[PDB]
Amino acid sequence: LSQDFVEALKAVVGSPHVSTASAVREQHGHDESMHRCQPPDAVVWPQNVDQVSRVASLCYNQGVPIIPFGTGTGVEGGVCAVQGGVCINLTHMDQITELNTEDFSVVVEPGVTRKALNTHLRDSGLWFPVDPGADASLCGMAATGASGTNAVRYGTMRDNVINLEVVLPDGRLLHTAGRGRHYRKSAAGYNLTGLFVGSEGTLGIITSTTLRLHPAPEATVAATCAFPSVQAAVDSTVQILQAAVPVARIEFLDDVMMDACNRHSKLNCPVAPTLFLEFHGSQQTLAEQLQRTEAITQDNGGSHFSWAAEKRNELWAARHNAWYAALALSPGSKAYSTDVCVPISRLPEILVETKEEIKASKLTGAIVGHVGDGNFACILLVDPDDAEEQRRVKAFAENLGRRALALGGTCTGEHGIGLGKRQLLQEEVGPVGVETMRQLKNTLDPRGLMNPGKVL
Ligand SMILES: Cc1cc2nc3c(=O)[nH]c(=O)nc-3n(C[C@H](O)[C@H](O)[C@H](O)COP(=O)(O)OP(=O)(O)OC[C@H]3O[C@@H](n4cnc5c(N)ncnc54)[C@H](O)[C@@H]3O)c2cc1C
Ligand SMILES: CCCCCC[C@@H](O)C(=O)O
């Protein structure tokens, strides 16, 4: 990468906000996944949207790939610079604006995390519910199409993103639903907001997100429930959803995951396939939800609910850190994660089959999941140097993905495609789906410089 080009970057953002140092590039060449670090040729920190536009235009016109970077907590190598280029770290733009409590909306820049937003919001009576375990950039969450434990009740990023400010690959500034707009519904033209949610940095750079806020619940009850078998826990989940209980959180941990979380958090739950549950409402509504939900879990051998401010906080902090609890089981290890999502009635079959398949192989694995959405993750520990093990783990992940596709589901409920699921995506949407996605990619990124090598 030429020093004339580097000087042009520094002319936009300032010398301290451009780095070509190997260590700095290496830190920005990977996410939290196993995917091998592929360092960008430079890291740039734009300080405002004008600078984002001018960095993009400079890179695009010079044929230099652009890799948007939020908090680097992604799962599929989205920030790996497989063709080199310029990594754009967006987190110095960290302001919350346009807080409209009366309209339940707010605008956030890429450096705002969920914890920052919800801290800004306490005593407002509002909160933002979409809660991935890592305290990620909210714009990165929009880019990946994230969900979380609260999504079963309060929706995914796709449900809660009302507008996006996007710097297109050649530097033009798009407000997907119109500058400054925020509303509950619209039929005006084609919905551009939904196209950029889940685009993973391959269609443009999200420089702000307009988010739906929600009223804080009147009252909250959290509990855990231990089951004799994976079958029993997942059958309970399906029956709770079919009974239309509006549970706020319903999370599955298999016995391996529950033990891992016990050892990583000093929870001390019975080591067993377990549901973490949370219920929102008034005292009247809570008692009714609890009664209907306990009746279903009782039918399937669930324990009496172990009840959990600090104790629910400890409970969900342990759940949010399940990934690290799993890694802590074999220290030094990395891991791959699957993310299939199936029609809920097929969830017992596939998740029990996954448990059986884990057992029948030399691989080790833990299961945790947003099962209220029909979604779960298999966490598969890999020795970074054992290439024999890595290709069994890859083979296992591909086979699980294909089983989910055979059941009418999707290969990823929330994490995305990145580098790891591109073949599964081709199978999932077929030739006309792939060509159509590629045609959209091409009109927004003709030169193919917007995070190349990802998704398609
Ligand atoms: C412990 C743990 C728990 C997690 N739990 C969940 C969970 O429950 N649900 C879930 O969905 N995910 C979960 N994640 C994954 C991850 O936190 C989410 O995918 C998150 O949305 C990634 O945001 P990020 O800014 O850290 O992404 P990064 O890794 O920085 O980037 C992810 C992708 O988005 C692109 N990108 C990032 N910012 C922008 C932007 N502003 N504009 C355009 N493209 C951009 C990147 O180019 C890349 O392709 C978890 C991760 C960890 C480590
Ligand atoms: C590389 C990070 C992968 C984290 C997988 C588990 C996450 O989805 C959750 O549900 O806690």
Kindly state whether residues 68 and 104 are assigned to the same domain: no
Q: What residue type is 224 in one-letter code? A: T
Integer angstrom CA distances of residue 248 from 21, 159, 353, 440 = 46, 15, 27, 36
Site to probe by mutation for ligand 2, drawn from 370, 415, 421 as the one with most ligand atoms within 8 Å of Cβ, is 415
Neighbouring C-alpha atoms within 13 Å toward the C-beta of 189: 7
| Same domain, yes or no: 310 and 345 | no
Contacts of 437 (CB under 8 A, 6+ apart): 429, 455, 456
Centre of ligand 2 from the C-alpha of residue 323, in Å: 6
Any ligand 2 atom below 6 A from CB of 375: no
SS3 assignment, position 274: strand
Residue 289 CA, ligand 1 centroid: distance in Å: 33
Q: List the residue whose alpha carbon is closest to atom 37 of ligand 1.
A: 140
Q: Is residue 442 part of a domain?
A: no
Let me know whether 104 and 126 are in one domain. yes
Residue 188 CB contacts under 8 Å (≥ 6 apart), including other chains = none
Alpha helices in 100-169 (DSSP H): 114-120, 138-144, 151-154, 157-160
Residue with tokens 């996605």: 437
* Residue that is last in its domain, among 215, 230, 265: 215
Integer Cα distance of 353 and 372 in angstroms? 18
In a domain, 444, yes or no: no
The CATH number linked to 171 is 3.30.465.10
Residue 144 CA to ligand 2 center (angstroms) comes to 13
Taking CA atoms only, the protein residue closest to ligand 1 atom 44 is 201
Question: Same domain, yes or no, for 122 and 188?
Answer: yes
* Of 313, 298, 314, residue with least CA distance to 264: 314
Q: Which ligand is nearest to the CA of 147?
A: 1
Resolution of this entry, Å: 1.8
Can you tell me which atom of ligand 2 is nearest the CA of 75? 1
**What residues are paired with 220 via a beta bridge?**
280
In a 3-state reduction of DSSP, which class is residue 211?
strand
121 and 183 in a single domain? The answer is: yes
CB-CB contact of 414 with 368 (8 Å): no
| CATH value at residue 365 | 3.30.70.2740
Contact indicator for 20, 6 with CB cutoff of 8 Å: yes
* 120 φ/ψ sector (left φ>0, alpha ψ -120 to 50, else beta): alpha
Angle between helices 3-13 and 49-61 (to 10 degrees): 160
CA 248 to chain CA centroid, nearest Å: 18
In a mutational test of the pocket of ligand 1, which residue from 48, 107, 144 has the highest number of ligand atoms less than 8 Å from its CB?
Answer: 144
C-beta 338 within 6 A of ligand 2: no
**Residue 433 resides in a domain:** no
Ligand 1 mean position to 388 CA, how many Å?
A: 28
Pairwise CA distance, residues 336 & 76, whole Å: 9
Could you tell me if residue 407 is inside a domain? yes
Query: Which ligand gives the minimal distance to the CA of 74?
Result: 1
Write out the residue range of the structural domain in which residue 389 sits. Answer: 331-421
The sign of the torsion formed by the CA atoms of 65, 68, 73, 75 equals negative
Instruction: Please tell me the total count of domains within the chain.
Output: 4
Q: Say if 398 falls within a structural domain.
A: yes
- Report CA torsion sign: 407, 365, 377, 383: negative
Residues having CB within 6 Å of any atom of ligand 1: 31-32, 67-75, 78-79, 90, 110, 132-134, 136-137, 139-141, 143-144, 146-148, 200-201, 205-206, 323-324, 414-415, 418, 451, 454
Domain membership of residue 146 (yes or no) is: yes
Q: Give the mutation target among 34, 35, 36, 75 for probing the ligand 2 site: most ligand atoms within 8 A of CB.
A: 75
403 and 355 both lie in a single domain: yes
Assign residue 273 the CATH number of its domain.
3.30.70.2190
Q: Does ligand 2 have an atom closer than 6 angstroms to the CB of 323? A: yes
Degrees to nearest 5, angle at CA 67 with 65 and 69: 165
Give domain status of residue 240, yes or no.
Answer: yes
CATH number, domain of 11, equals 3.30.43.10
Residue found by looking up tokens 């050649």 in the block:
170
Residue 300 and residue 359 in one domain: no
Q: Which of 329, 364, 391 is the last residue of a domain?
A: 329
Q: Tally Cβ neighbours within 10 Å of residue 213.
A: 22
What span, in angstroms and rounded, lies between the C-alpha atoms of 403 and 422?
16
User: Quick check: is 435 in a domain?
Assistant: no
**377 CA to centre of ligand 2 in angstroms:** 7
Please tell me the residue having the least CA distance from ligand 1 atom 16. 74
Residue with tokens 């051998």: 301
Return d(Cα 54, Cα 274) in angstroms, integer.
Answer: 51
Ligand 2 closest atom vs CA 32: 1
The C-alpha atoms of residue 245 and residue 248 are separated, in whole angstroms, by: 9
Q: Are residues 48 and 159 in the same domain?
A: no
**Does one domain contain both 101 and 207?**
yes
Using DSSP, how many helices (H) and how many strands (E) does the chain show? 16, 18
Q: How far apart are CA 273 and CA 277, in angstroms?
A: 13
Asked if 65 and 75 count as a contact pair (C-beta separation under 8 A), the reply is no
Tell me the best of 337, 376, 379 to mutate to test the pocket of ligand 2, counting ligand atoms within 8 Å of each CB and taking the most.
Answer: 337
Residues 213-217: contacts with CB under 8 Å, at least 24 apart = 213/101, 213/104, 213/105, 213/106, 213/121, 213/126, 213/127, 213/128, 214/104, 214/126, 214/127, 214/128, 214/129, 214/154, 215/104, 215/125, 215/126, 216/125, 216/126, 216/127, 217/248, 217/280, 217/281
Q: If DSSP codes are grouped into helix, strand and coil, which group holds residue 141?
A: helix
Pocket test for ligand 1, best of 43, 45, 69 (most atoms within 8 A of CB): 69
Find, among 43, 40, 35, 42, the residue nearest to 77 by Cα: 35
> Are the C-beta atoms of residues 302 and 231 closer than 8 Å to each other?
no
Residue 205 and residue 227 share a domain? no
Report the distance separating Cα 366 and Cα 378, nearest Å.
Answer: 6
- Residue 175 φ/ψ, nearest 5 degrees: -105, 110
Specify the DSSP class assigned to residue 47: S
- Looking at the fold, whether 24 and 116 belong to one and the same domain comes out as no
Write the Ramachandran bin of 72: left for phi over 0, alpha for psi from -120 to 50, otherwise beta: left
Number of Cβ atoms within 10 Å of the Cβ of 329: 18
Residue 322 Cβ contacting ligand 2 at under 6 Å: yes
Q: Do 235 and 154 reside in the same domain of the chain?
A: no
Please state the length of the chain.
Answer: 456
SS3 56: helix
Final residue belonging to a domain, choices 305, 329, 353: 329
Nearest ligand 2 atom to alpha carbon 320: 11
